[PDB]
Amino acid sequence: SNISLTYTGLYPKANDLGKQYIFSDGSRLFVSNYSRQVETF
């Protein structure tokens, strides 16, 4: 508390837009290509 420390670890890059995932609502359902898109962990 009340102290600024330098930490090395797993953090996101500053001003990173990332990837946006949008979901909708339906009978037949509406979806994107997300299930076939394989990202790298």
Ligand X SMILES: *[C@@H]1O[C@H](CO)[C@@H](O)[C@H](O)[C@H]1NC(C)=O
Question: Which residues form the interface with ligand X (CB under 6 A)?
Answer: 33, 36-37
Residue keyed to tokens 């990173």? 16
Query: Whose CB is nearest to ligand X?
Result: 33
Check residue 9 and report its DSSP letter. S
CA angle at residue 36 from 30 to 23, to 5 degrees?
A: 35
Answer yes or no whether residue 1 interacts with other proteins by CB under 8 A: no
CB of 13: closest distance to ligand X in angstroms? 23
- The number of residues making up the chain comes to 41
User: Can residue 6 be called a binding residue for other proteins (CB under 8 A)?
Assistant: yes
Binding residues for other proteins, rule: CB under 8 A, are 5-6, 8
